[PDB]
Write an enzyme that holds these catalytic residues in place. Structure first.
Site, short mmCIF file in Angstrom:
data_model
loop_
_atom_site.label_atom_id
_atom_site.label_comp_id
_atom_site.label_asym_id
_atom_site.label_seq_id
_atom_site.Cartn_x
_atom_site.Cartn_y
_atom_site.Cartn_z
N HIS B 61 46.64 38.61 34.48
CA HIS B 61 45.32 38.20 34.77
C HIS B 61 44.67 38.96 35.94
N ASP B 91 21.94 64.09 36.29
CA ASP B 91 23.05 63.38 35.97
C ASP B 91 24.07 63.45 37.07
N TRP B 126 50.65 40.85 40.57
CA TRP B 126 50.26 42.18 40.46
C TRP B 126 50.51 43.11 41.95
N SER B 156 41.89 57.70 36.88
CA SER B 156 40.60 57.80 36.54
C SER B 156 39.49 57.27 37.69
N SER B 157 40.06 56.45 38.75
CA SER B 157 39.26 56.13 39.80
C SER B 157 39.05 57.11 40.99
N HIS B 240 44.74 46.38 50.63
CA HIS B 240 43.42 45.79 51.63
C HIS B 240 42.21 46.68 51.43
N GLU B 242 41.52 47.92 48.70
CA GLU B 242 40.93 47.67 47.29
C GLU B 242 40.28 46.37 47.25
N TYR B 244 38.08 45.43 49.49
CA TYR B 244 36.57 46.03 49.88
C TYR B 244 35.94 46.96 48.90
N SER B 255 22.09 43.33 48.07
CA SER B 255 20.83 43.95 48.66
C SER B 255 19.64 44.33 47.92
N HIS B 290 48.12 41.99 57.31
CA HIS B 290 47.95 40.62 57.37
C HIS B 290 48.47 39.98 55.91
N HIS B 291 48.80 40.93 55.11
CA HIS B 291 49.60 40.47 53.86
C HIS B 291 50.89 40.38 53.84
N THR B 316 30.34 42.08 58.34
CA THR B 316 29.99 41.29 57.49
C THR B 316 28.75 40.47 57.48
N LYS B 319 25.52 41.58 57.47
CA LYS B 319 25.03 41.77 56.22
C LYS B 319 24.43 40.27 55.61
N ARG B 438 52.17 29.46 45.42
CA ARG B 438 51.67 30.59 44.68
C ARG B 438 52.75 30.74 43.64
C1 HEA Z 1 36.43 40.72 47.44
C2 HEA Z 1 37.70 40.43 47.70
C3 HEA Z 1 38.20 40.13 49.14
C4 HEA Z 1 37.40 40.16 50.10
C5 HEA Z 1 35.88 40.77 50.49
C6 HEA Z 1 38.34 39.93 51.36
C7 HEA Z 1 37.91 39.49 52.49
C8 HEA Z 1 38.79 39.20 53.64
N1 HEA Z 1 40.03 38.52 53.40
FE1 HEA Z 1 41.13 38.64 51.74
N2 HEA Z 1 42.23 38.66 50.12
C9 HEA Z 1 41.76 38.96 48.81
C10 HEA Z 1 40.34 39.37 48.27
C11 HEA Z 1 39.29 39.34 49.46
N3 HEA Z 1 39.41 39.45 50.70
C12 HEA Z 1 42.79 39.05 47.92
C13 HEA Z 1 42.78 39.23 46.35
C14 HEA Z 1 43.86 38.40 48.95
C15 HEA Z 1 45.18 38.17 48.00
C16 HEA Z 1 45.99 39.26 47.72
C17 HEA Z 1 47.26 38.62 46.87
O1 HEA Z 1 48.32 38.48 47.75
O2 HEA Z 1 47.47 38.60 45.64
C18 HEA Z 1 43.38 38.21 50.04
C19 HEA Z 1 44.30 37.89 51.00
C20 HEA Z 1 43.94 37.87 52.30
C21 HEA Z 1 44.85 37.69 53.42
C22 HEA Z 1 46.18 37.60 53.10
C23 HEA Z 1 46.64 35.78 53.13
C24 HEA Z 1 48.10 35.55 52.83
O3 HEA Z 1 48.59 36.16 51.82
O4 HEA Z 1 48.87 34.91 53.30
C25 HEA Z 1 44.26 37.62 54.40
C26 HEA Z 1 44.84 37.61 55.66
O5 HEA Z 1 44.17 37.92 56.73
C27 HEA Z 1 42.87 37.79 54.03
C28 HEA Z 1 41.71 37.86 55.30
C29 HEA Z 1 40.50 38.41 54.75
C30 HEA Z 1 39.11 38.27 55.53
C31 HEA Z 1 39.37 38.21 57.20
C32 HEA Z 1 38.11 39.03 54.89
C33 HEA Z 1 36.90 39.50 55.58
O6 HEA Z 1 36.66 40.62 54.94
C34 HEA Z 1 35.90 38.29 55.37
C35 HEA Z 1 34.65 38.18 56.45
C36 HEA Z 1 33.57 37.51 56.08
C37 HEA Z 1 33.00 36.43 56.69
C38 HEA Z 1 33.68 35.94 58.07
C39 HEA Z 1 31.77 35.76 55.89
C40 HEA Z 1 30.52 36.30 56.52
C41 HEA Z 1 30.49 36.22 57.93
C42 HEA Z 1 29.44 35.47 58.59
C43 HEA Z 1 28.54 34.52 58.38
C44 HEA Z 1 29.44 35.86 60.22
C45 HEA Z 1 29.86 34.75 61.14
C46 HEA Z 1 31.42 34.42 60.82
C47 HEA Z 1 32.35 34.32 61.80
C48 HEA Z 1 31.95 34.30 63.16
C49 HEA Z 1 33.94 34.11 61.72
N4 HEA Z 1 42.72 37.97 52.67
C1 HEA Z 2 38.31 39.79 40.15
C2 HEA Z 2 39.55 39.28 40.37
C3 HEA Z 2 39.87 37.95 39.60
C4 HEA Z 2 38.84 36.68 39.06
C5 HEA Z 2 37.18 37.15 38.67
C6 HEA Z 2 39.56 35.80 38.68
C7 HEA Z 2 39.17 34.83 37.96
C8 HEA Z 2 39.76 33.53 37.69
N1 HEA Z 2 41.08 33.12 38.26
FE1 HEA Z 2 42.34 34.49 39.17
N2 HEA Z 2 43.55 35.76 40.13
C9 HEA Z 2 43.32 36.92 40.61
C10 HEA Z 2 41.96 37.86 40.42
C11 HEA Z 2 40.99 37.09 39.91
N3 HEA Z 2 40.72 35.98 39.23
C12 HEA Z 2 44.36 37.55 41.31
C13 HEA Z 2 44.10 39.01 42.15
C14 HEA Z 2 45.39 36.58 41.26
C15 HEA Z 2 46.99 36.86 41.87
C16 HEA Z 2 47.77 37.31 40.96
C17 HEA Z 2 49.18 37.10 41.55
O1 HEA Z 2 49.43 36.09 42.21
O2 HEA Z 2 49.91 38.16 41.20
C18 HEA Z 2 44.89 35.71 40.52
C19 HEA Z 2 45.55 34.31 40.53
C20 HEA Z 2 45.12 33.15 39.86
C21 HEA Z 2 45.49 32.02 39.98
C22 HEA Z 2 46.79 31.49 40.70
C23 HEA Z 2 48.06 31.62 39.71
C24 HEA Z 2 49.44 31.26 40.57
O3 HEA Z 2 49.52 31.48 41.78
O4 HEA Z 2 50.40 30.91 39.90
C25 HEA Z 2 44.74 30.95 39.30
C26 HEA Z 2 44.99 29.71 39.13
O5 HEA Z 2 44.02 28.82 38.90
C27 HEA Z 2 43.65 31.83 38.94
C28 HEA Z 2 42.65 31.29 38.11
C29 HEA Z 2 41.40 31.69 37.70
C30 HEA Z 2 40.35 31.41 36.92
C31 HEA Z 2 40.37 29.84 36.59
C32 HEA Z 2 39.31 32.45 36.99
C33 HEA Z 2 38.15 32.08 36.35
O6 HEA Z 2 36.92 31.94 37.59
C34 HEA Z 2 37.54 33.22 35.57
C35 HEA Z 2 36.23 32.77 34.68
C36 HEA Z 2 35.63 33.57 34.03
C37 HEA Z 2 34.84 34.64 34.62
C38 HEA Z 2 34.67 34.93 36.05
C39 HEA Z 2 34.17 35.66 33.49
C40 HEA Z 2 34.88 37.19 33.62
C41 HEA Z 2 33.96 38.10 33.36
C42 HEA Z 2 33.37 38.60 32.34
C43 HEA Z 2 33.43 38.08 31.10
C44 HEA Z 2 32.54 39.75 32.66
C45 HEA Z 2 31.16 39.98 31.97
C46 HEA Z 2 30.69 41.22 31.56
C47 HEA Z 2 29.43 41.73 31.96
C48 HEA Z 2 28.33 40.90 32.46
C49 HEA Z 2 29.13 43.50 31.83
N4 HEA Z 2 43.68 33.00 39.27
CU CU Z 3 43.69 41.96 53.03
#
Ligand code: HEA
Ligand code: HEA
Ligand code: CU
Ligand code: TGL
Ligand code: TGL
Ligand code: PEK
Ligand code: PSC
Ligand code: PGV
Ligand code: PGV
Ligand code: DMU
Ligand code: DMU
Ligand code: DMU
Ligand code: CHD
Ligand code: CHD
Ligand code: CUA
Ligand code: MG
Ligand code: NA
Ligand code: ZN
Lengths: 43, 514, 49, 84, 73, 105, 227, 49, 144, 58, 46
Positions: B61, B91, B126, B156-157, B240, B242, B244, B255, B290-291, B316, B319, B438
């Protein structure tokens, strides 16, 4: 944005067909697998 | 002619189209995997089998949603379609290498599917941590097929990143500085820098896992003096950046959308938006552990990673506030793409804030490896990256296709999806605070109510995905051809009509220096 | 200059504006940039120029 | 290499001012904050008249000959120990 | 007839913004006060009240007599 | 920057240019409506008389419509502005959107 | 343990876990305020027909919304790091216990004095006794003395696991070749439950942790009886 | 001329809402889903040992 | 009236309340009577009839501000359709419960829950706030 | 050796509509068919191998 | 050259909306069905 009227208008009846076919294309194959899960595990 | 055009392409629009189709198909696969997860958890007990088949589904998934849906759609799809048009370039810099970045992805996807069909699949998460992903606990081909799938997606990327950086630096009009290019272009350049630096490190780590599995190395095996925790450092040094990479092109499209449907000629605070994306890109490389707050790291290290992670909230937040200031005073057009962007602004903020909760390593002890993490990242991914994708898709579909969507259906689609994703993920905060782990196929009885609700939410989102397919069908079925688009004076990618001719900017734009 | 009868112009109205204003310039009487009024006139030719 | 960001579209004064105000001075501000927190006088350690420390082979050419140039009474013991 | 008076005609958006940012700030303070009383302080007080006269041996004896332990019948 | 009076004066001068052309009339009104204000009657007066020198009755009516639109929910502003413009409306023969029925949805 | 419809953390059993609850309350208040403020400002930007579409200067306002978030972060970071370091403080345990993760169960070793060790497996659902909890009970509980500082050492003899007890605020990964340390102190007798917290294969969901906190004299006699 | 929404909006809104409420209420109450609510104020504890 | 695709590079008409004077007139071709009306427009507008003033407006512009700004009944369709499809989703969940899910574990039987509840109270699960705090150990009932 | 770049410039600029990968003449066509045949044939073989490996073999 | 314009800059035909519905149905349907059949396959092994 502006646009021309449809060159090939899709009536409500046609939309109902497209939406029904779309939904069934997702639901029937998954439904079939999930309906038979027990037969897969009990095997 | 068909093979020349679609298999031998050197054209940025057609390759962009290929990526959009590929990512849409991947999105279906990843959606089905997500419904299998939530079916398993939708009532207490065991539906499918034990944690192995369950976590093959979970593992796939995530790889599907990340590597075959989000990144191909944002970077390969919107990037290729929009970036050359937004800078007036004829292009991409390397139009033939561009095509290989696309064509590496169907084989990468095939290898991941093969991994799940052979033996018992890769049920690793994953993150693919050893020793579970090693050759004793995951004997056989599945994990190696997964590693190779990542290799090809990585190549690819990396080549796409080279292409995008080169194109954006080298192929603007000679008068246009980097500070006169649109924010979506900035967001792609910065994401490509992050890909360039981070993916080689992932490649190194997974190659070490491959050799530990097959060549008797012991990078991660204590018996040879290796360390499983080294794998985690290498993986998260990529992992991490990734996330961003996954959100920055989304920020770029947000934007443009907010600016456009506010009736504004420019986003608020353009240089602050550039600063914020660059700052996010940079800070995103110094926070990875932090992971790893529960692996046994020294306290001063935890203090540092706590503090550095929270800093990212500052750029952030600029933004977010700048998007709100772009809406301010707008002549607001409540188009479906605007609704997606507004839902983005709010739900992304919630998920960012729960990420700041998790940044506190003391609290993360209790939240780590629980559904609170799952709730954080699906707010930024399913209600952030995906909402930006849907917003960009509805906004630019008339440019790419020459046809209009039915806006009323697109608003219905947004409404359904908004209910479904919030119903799915909001209760997961409670499950995480109260300690549900999890990667579990079943849970103590106390956790039933929120799991039941979460799974019902996931079916609402399924209905929205089905409706989306119908909506695209209805647009191509009815063939409403675009006539006029507003605001072309500040949205160059529309100025060659809908769809633009195969070759655009054969004669480049005229921009003087004065 | 142009090798056809229209070309896109981008006009940076004031030094260091990040916003570029884009419009089609057509053969004939000079046209003005929508944002700031600066005039532009097309001088079509064959690429022997 | 290893960091991120991503300009290099043409170097100039505007870009280096952007780096000055957007990366360099914020770094200094952050480190200034960090330093302002971990300040505050640590407990000084018991004096031990180690013979490899407080070396005196010739008197210093200032003061009483036995004080280093930036002598701090709180933390710099004389060869005979801390002052009163 | 009487003429209509001249109304304010400039800065109406900015005036609206200023007034509501300020109202938002006041509400944010109103909420923070309510949350500290209803959540944060409530919690401190529940924990301090629970432990103030807590008798861990009495608690254990009740559990032991209920049969909950492997190590203590 | 400039006071309110300096702003209004610049805009009055702009529309009063005797040989103002149609491009300048449009550029002027489309720029003006981006500001956070409803234009003073003296500005609108100058723009209507520009419409007159340009023989463009329709744009005169449209300018009155955008005055009403810029007021948003402040329903008192537009009737005040019309009241202040009535001498000009009568001198130039400009009918309001309301008198033409163009305020009907 | 968790209970049905639970919204927040399990009740604190140790002083550290109580500290975390108060810090989480503090942080959650900020999260609610900021998210509310954003939702509210969104609605405010969207609810007027008044417009202002000319170019807007950004310098002054970006001070506000950099400096205020920096301040808020510092108000989070200060109590966060205080708890961090207090969790690291030296405390002098009076007992050390080791736990080794395995696929799929935990073993425990109490070797300060005698060679005491045993395995601890989930009770199958078909064998629960009436009133016992599905997926949480074990056959051999980790008996420990209440109101004392205990050193827990965690490792694994196969893949990664992680040893967690949420109501004591504990989660320490179980890594083969590595001996991770944490400190445990229960303010109360009773039964405290946790679950394996690192994906470890087919029965990761089914290898729980049950601590049984009793007075020291009971722990000593139990320990003797387990030799 | 009245559009789709003028002609059908009221009925789409009324029928959609009535259907949605009815089918979710039936799903939630009539087909044996176990919501596992809190026992507090609901369950009379019974001797177990 | 008729906008063509092959016109996209040309200045175009739009009705936008923030761009009140578009780049071209709505109607560029004029009939004999419409020509005469544009000539009459060069004389005092007080001599134009109301119908002539309206016609001049409709040559220049397509919709008035009131027309372009009108509210619509679309929300009814959007909200009702969304609720329809959300209701449809519940049909999928009914199907799933009927054909896919088997019995849930015996630990949710009423008697098991009642015994499990007492035992949680006997071990004082969450005794400060969460669970046992809500039980009155002296009166042997749930606190009111 | 002698500089024969001018001759190659004439060859590859000849106005014959051929894409650059075939513009060398008949040998390009052969090497192209060999490459594409190995790739397409190899890809089918790999699918066969997936099919084989997708099931147990006792 | 290549065909240009709406419906012509894509690798699938939109000339008949019902053939298109079938194509889209196979395309998105195959992607959504694949994980269910992979799960079945793994269950039928062991
Ligand atoms: C789009 C994907 C995305 C983005 C943008 C982020 C953004 C951030 N994430 Fe992440 N994160 C994931 C996808 C993402 N994350 C995924 C997939 C994992 C799990 C991986 C895995 O284990 O499988 C994960 C796990 C993860 C962890 C590990 C937790 C754990 O496993 O125990 C942590 C811990 O610090 C973390 C922190 C953050 C923080 C601080 C940001 C910051 O970038 C967010 C900053 C944004 C704001 C704060 C909101 C806007 C701000 C304002 C309105 C300003 C005022 C706010 C304050 C003064 C606080 N993330
Ligand atoms: C982009 C990343 C992404 C997205 C979109 C989602 C979407 C969803 N995920 Fe995701 N999920 C992960 C990334 C994501 N997940 C990751 C990284 C993990 C951790 C894996 C691990 O533990 O190893 C995870 C784990 C995770 C779990 C935890 C499993 C566990 O700990 O046992 C669950 C459980 O409910 C969950 C549920 C869902 C559900 C219900 C959605 C639904 O919201 C999805 C609904 C459908 C959409 C959002 C449509 C999808 C998009 C299209 C059809 C594209 C259309 C195309 C064009 C317009 C061009 N996911
Ligand atoms: Cu991170
Ligand atoms: C935020 C995304 C959108 C919201 C989506 C769902 C909205 C509905 C709910 C949601 C309605 C908004 C209120 C949110 C909190 C509600 C529950 C709570 O009491 O939370 C308590 C705590 C800790 O709890 C304790 O230790 C004390 C328990 C006190 C018990 C007293 C009884 C309380 C009532 C019972 C709750 C009912 C369950 C709700 C079940 C909900 C299921 C879906 O849990 C937590 O930390 C949860 C952590 C969540 C962090 C994300 C914050 C985002 C907020 C956005 C708000 C802006 C305005 C929304 C305006 C909303 C409109 C956009
Ligand atoms: C509005 C707040 C939004 C908050 C959003 C936050 C982020 C969330 C995502 C952001 C999501 C934003 C959705 C906002 C809907 C705006 C409606 C609208 O004015 O649309 C425009 C109208 C037509 O309007 C026009 O022709 C002219 C332009 C529009 C009006 C502009 C003028 C407004 C100013 C006047 C206001 C005066 C007050 C003064 C006050 C000032 C005091 C001084 O279209 C229509 O008739 C139909 C539109 C239907 C929208 C329904 C989608 C709802 C999705 C959410 C889940 C629902 C689940 C249901 C199913 C549930 C099943 C269980
Ligand atoms: C930014 C803050 C520091 C700025 C620099 C300060 C002065 C450095 C000047 C030059 C350094 C050159 C000589 C180095 C000599 C030692 C000075 C080292 C810097 C210093 O200032 O060291 C101080 C000692 O100064 C002392 O002895 C007395 C120093 C005064 C006498 C110096 C005499 C020696 C000059 C020799 C010059 C040789 C030049 C050769 C050039 C040849 C080129 C081909 C340390 O103070 P302290 O109390 O011991 O400990 C602190 C406890 N609280
Ligand atoms: C979760 C995030 C929130 C965290 C907290 C954030 C709080 C932010 C609060 C900020 C309030 C700032 C309000 C500024 C509004 C006042 C300025 C304005 O709106 O007015 C404009 C000023 O523009 C000028 O030059 C100067 C430049 C343009 C000024 C308008 C743009 C500034 C708008 C800021 C919008 C913020 C929107 C909300 C974001 C949170 C126009 O003014 P002038 O006199 O020049 O023209 C008037 C013509 N006269 C002279 C004839 C009358
Ligand atoms: C541009 C850079 C600017 C400078 C930024 C600061 C960077 C610092 C890198 C410092 C690395 C060397 C530090 C060595 C000091 C000894 C540390 C050590 O030896 O730590 C070991 C791992 O070391 C290790 O450096 C592993 C070493 C490699 C770690 C790499 C981490 C950062 C990688 C960034 C790469 C960017 C790309 C560069 C190329 C252009 C872990 O074991 P201990 O921690 O002992 O725990 C044992 C105790 O808990 C109990 O007894
Ligand atoms: C586990 C086993 C996994 C194995 C996976 C292997 C996967 C890939 C198969 C690779 C087949 C390679 C075939 C040759 C590709 C040459 C690309 C090239 O040379 O690309 C050039 C651009 O890249 C540039 O320069 C600079 C870039 C040159 C890149 C050359 C190719 C690198 C391929 C491997 C990349 C990853 C390396 C490791 C990074 C960690 C030219 O760009 P074009 O658009 O073509 O033309 C532009 C025209 O104007 C030229 O006249
Ligand atoms: C997570 C995504 C899945 C969402 C849920 C799908 C919703 C329902 C889809 C309907 O699927 C069909 O359901 C039938 C039952 O209603 C099955 O027929 C089965 O049951 C019938 C009645 O018992 C027999 O006639 C058939 O032979 C037998 O195949 C049929 O195979 C299956 O295609
Ligand atoms: C396969 C899907 C089947 C969908 C079935 C839809 C049935 C519609 C039920 C709702 O009926 C509505 O009830 C209202 C009374 O309050 C009426 O006033 C309203 O006009 C009516 O329409
Ligand atoms: C233009 C496209 C090209 C497509 C070409 C397709 C070629 C197909 C040839 C079939 O080869 C099979 O593969 C293995 C080797 O070729 C052999 O196994 C054997 O091969 C190895 C020989 O090195 C031994 O190590 C092993 O014992 C044993 O499994 C097996 O007998 C042979 O039938
Ligand atoms: C100097 C540079 C570019 C200015 C320009 O040439 O247009 C600007 C763009 C964004 C600005 C930064 C952002 O507005 C964020 C911060 C805002 C604070 O008020 C000052 C520091 C702060 C870090 C700013 C410093 C500096 O003014 C930056 C970095
Ligand atoms: C024949 C050629 C002259 C270049 C030209 O005019 O064609 C000469 C000049 C430089 C020579 C090469 C260089 O001297 C370097 C090499 C030296 C070795 O001793 C012979 C091979 C060697 C590789 C030479 C081969 C050949 O004789 C070259 C290539
Ligand atoms: Cu052991 Cu998970
Ligand atoms: Mg973990
Ligand atoms: Na389950
Ligand atoms: Zn200009």
């Amino acid at each position: 944005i502006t646009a021309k009227p449809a060159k090939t208008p899709t009536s409500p009846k046609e939309q109902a067909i497209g939406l029904s076919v779309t939904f069934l294309s997702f639901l029937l194959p998954a439904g079939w697998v999930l309906y038979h899960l027990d037969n897969y595990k009990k095997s | 002619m068909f093979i020349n055009r679609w298999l031998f392409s050197t054209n940025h629009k057609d390759i962009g189209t290929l990526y959009l189709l590929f990512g849409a198909w991947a999105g279906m696969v990843g959606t089905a995997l997500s419904l299998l997860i939530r079916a398993e958890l939708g009532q207490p007990g065991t539906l499918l089998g034990d944690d192995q088949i369950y976590n093959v589904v979970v593992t796939a998934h995530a790889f599907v949603m990340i590597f075959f849906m989000v990144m191909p759609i944002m970077i390969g799809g919107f990037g290729n379609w929009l970036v050359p048009l937004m800078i007036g370039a004829p292009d991409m810099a390397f139009p033939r290498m561009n095509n290989m970045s696309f064509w590496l992805l169907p084989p990468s996807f095939l290898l991941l599917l093969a991994s799940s069909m052979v033996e018992a699949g890769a049920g690793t998460g994953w993150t693919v941590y050893p020793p579970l992903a090693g050759n004793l606990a995951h004997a056989g081909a599945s994990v190696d097929l997964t590693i190779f799938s990542l290799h090809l997606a990585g190549v690819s990327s990396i080549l796409g990143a080279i292409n995008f950086i080169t194109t954006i630096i080298n192929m603007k009009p000679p008068a246009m500085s980097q500070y006169q290019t649109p924010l979506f272009v900035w967001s792609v350049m910065i994401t490509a820098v992050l890909l360039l630096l981070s993916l080689p490190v992932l490649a190194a780590g997974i190659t070490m896992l491959l050799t530990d599995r097959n060549l008797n190395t012991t990078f991660f095996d204590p018996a040879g003096g290796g360390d499983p925790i080294l794998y985690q450092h290498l993986f998260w040094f990529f992992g991490h950046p990734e996330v961003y990479i996954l959100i920055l092109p989304g920020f770029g499209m947000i934007s443009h959308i907010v600016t456009y449907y506010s009736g504004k000629k420019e986003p608020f605070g353009y240089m602050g938006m550039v600063w914020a994306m660059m700052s996010i890109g940079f800070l995103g490389f110094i926070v990875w552990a932090h992971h790893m707050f529960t692996v046994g790291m020294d306290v001063d290290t935890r203090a540092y990673f706590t503090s550095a992670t929270m800093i990212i909230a500052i750029p952030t937040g600029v933004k977010v506030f700048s998007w709100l200031a772009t809406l301010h005073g707008g002549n607001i057009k409540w188009s479906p793409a605007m609704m997606w962007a507004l839902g983005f602004i709010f739900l992304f903020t919630v998920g960012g804030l729960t990420g700041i909760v998790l940044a506190n390593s003391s609290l993360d002890i209790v939240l780590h490896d629980t559904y609170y993490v799952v709730a954080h990242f699906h707010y930024v991914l399913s209600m952030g990256a995906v909402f930006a994708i849907m917003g960009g898709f509805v906004h630019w579909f008339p440019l790419f296709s020459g046809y209009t969507l039915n806006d009323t259906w697109a608003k219905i689609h947004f409404a359904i999806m908004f209910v479904g994703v919030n119903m799915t993920f909001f209760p997961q905060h409670f499950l995480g605070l109260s300690g549900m782990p999890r990667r579990y196929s079943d849970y103590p009885d106390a956790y039933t109510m929120w799991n039941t609700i979460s799974s019902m939410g996931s079916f609402i989102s399924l209905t929205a995905v089905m409706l989306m397919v119908f909506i695209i069908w209805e647009a191509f079925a009815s063939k409403r051809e675009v006539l006029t688009v507003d605001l072309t004076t500040t949205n160059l990618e529309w100025l060659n009509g809908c769809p633009p001719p195969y070759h655009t900017f054969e004669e480049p734009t005229y921009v003087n220096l004065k | 200059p142009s090798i056809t009868n229209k070309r896109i112009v981008g006009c940076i109205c004031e030094e260091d504006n990040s916003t570029v204003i884009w419009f089609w310039l057509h053969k004939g009487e000079a046209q003005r940039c929508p944002s700031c009024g600066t005039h532009y006139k097309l001088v079509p030719h064959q690429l022997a120029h | 290499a290893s960091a991120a960001k991503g300009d290099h579209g043409g170097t100039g004064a505007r870009t280096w001012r952007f780096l000055t105000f957007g990366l360099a001075l914020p770094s200094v501000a952050l480190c200034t904050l960090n330093s302002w927190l971990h300040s505050g006088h640590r407990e000084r350690p018991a004096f031990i008249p180690y013979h490899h420390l407080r070396i005196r082979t010739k008197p210093f050419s200032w003061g009483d000959g036995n004080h280093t140039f930036f002598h701090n009474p709180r933390v710099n013991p004389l060869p005979t120990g801390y002052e009163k | 007839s009487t003429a209509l008076a001249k109304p304010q005609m400039r800065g109406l958006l900015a005036r609206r913004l200023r007034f509501h940012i300020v109202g938002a700030f006041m509400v944010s303070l109103g909420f923070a006060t309510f949350y500290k009383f209803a959540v944060a302080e409530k919690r401190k007080k529940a924990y301090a009240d629970f432990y103030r006269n807590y008798d861990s041996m009495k608690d254990f004896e009740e559990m032991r007599k209920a049969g909950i332990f492997q190590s203590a019948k | 920057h400039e006071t309110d009076e300096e702003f209004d004066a610049r805009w009055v001068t702009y529309f009063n240019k005797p040989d103002i052309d149609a491009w300048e009339l449009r550029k002027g009104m489309n720029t003006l409506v981006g500001y956070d204000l409803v234009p003073e009657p003296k500005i609108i007066d100058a723009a209507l008389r520009a419409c007159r020198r340009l023989n463009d009755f329709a744009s005169a009516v449209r300018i009155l419509e955008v005055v009403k639109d810029k007021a948003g929910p402040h329903k008192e502003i537009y009737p005040y502005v019309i009241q202040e413009l009535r001498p000009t409306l009568n001198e130039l023969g400009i009918s309001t959107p309301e008198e033409l029925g163009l305020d009907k949805v | 343990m968790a209970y049905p419809m639970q919204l927040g953390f399990q009740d604190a059993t140790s002083p550290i876990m109580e500290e975390l609850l108060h810090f989480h309350d503090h942080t959650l208040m900020i999260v609610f305020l900021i998210s509310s403020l954003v939702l509210y400002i969104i609605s405010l930007m969207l609810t007027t027909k008044l417009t202002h579409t000319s170019t807007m200067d950004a310098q002054e306002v970006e001070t506000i919304w950099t400096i205020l978030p920096a301040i808020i972060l510092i108000l989070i970071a200060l109590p966060s790091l205080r708890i961090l370091y207090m969790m690291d403080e030296i405390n002098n345990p009076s007992l050390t216990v080791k736990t080794m993760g395995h696929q799929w169960y935990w073993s425990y070793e109490y070797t300060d004095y005698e060679d005491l060790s045993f395995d601890s497996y989930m009770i199958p659902t078909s064998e629960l006794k009436p009133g016992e909890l599905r997926l949480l009970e074990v056959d051999n509980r980790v008996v420990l003395p209440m109101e004392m500082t205990i050193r827990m050492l965690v490792s694994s003899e196969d893949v990664l696991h992680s040893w967690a007890v949420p109501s004591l605020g504990l989660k320490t990964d179980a890594i083969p070749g590595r001996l991770n340390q944490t400190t445990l102190m229960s303010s109360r007798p009773g039964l405290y439950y946790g679950q394996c917290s690192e994906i470890c294969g087919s029965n990761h969901s089914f290898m729980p942790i049950v601590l049984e906190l009793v007075p020291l004299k009971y722990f000593e006699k139990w320990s003797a009886s387990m030799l | 001329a009245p559009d789709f929404h003028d002609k059908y909006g009221n009925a789409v809104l009324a029928s959609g809402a009535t259907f949605c409420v009815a089918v979710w209420v039936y799903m939630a109450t009539q087909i044996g889903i176990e919501w596992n609510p809190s026992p507090v104020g609901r369950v009379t504890p019974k001797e177990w040992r | 009236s008729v906008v063509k695709s092959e016109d996209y590079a040309l200045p175009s008409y739009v009705d936008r309340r923030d761009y009140p004077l578009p780049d071209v007139a709505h109607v560029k071709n004029l009939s004999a009577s419409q020509k005469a009306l544009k000539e009459k427009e060069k004389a005092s507008w007080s001599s134009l009839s109301i119908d002539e003033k309206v016609e001049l407006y409709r040559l220049k512009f397509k919709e008035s501000f009131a027309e372009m700004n009108r509210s619509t009944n679309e929300w009814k369709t959007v909200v009702g359709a969304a609720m329809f499809f959300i209701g449809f989703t519940a049909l999928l969940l009914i199907w799933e419960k009927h054909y896919v899910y088997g019995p849930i574990p015996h630990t949710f039987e009423e008697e098991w829950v009642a015994k499990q509840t007492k035992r949680m109270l006997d071990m004082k699960v969450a005794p400060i706030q969460g669970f046992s705090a809500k039980w009155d150990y002296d009166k042997n009932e749930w606190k009111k | 050796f002698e500089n024969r770049v001018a001759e190659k410039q004439k060859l590859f600029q000849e106005d014959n509509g051929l894409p650059v990968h075939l513009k060398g003449g008949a040998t390009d066509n052969i090497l192209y068919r060999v490459t594409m045949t190995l790739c397409l044939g190899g890809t089918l073989y790999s699918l066969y191998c997936l099919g084989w490996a997708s099931f147990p073999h006792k | 050259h290549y065909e240009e314009g709406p419906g012509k800059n894509i690798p699938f035909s939109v000339e008949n909306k019902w053939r298109l519905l079938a194509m889209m149905t196979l395309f998105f349907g195959s992607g959504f069905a694949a994980p269910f059949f992979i799960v079945r396959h793994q269950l039928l092994k062991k």
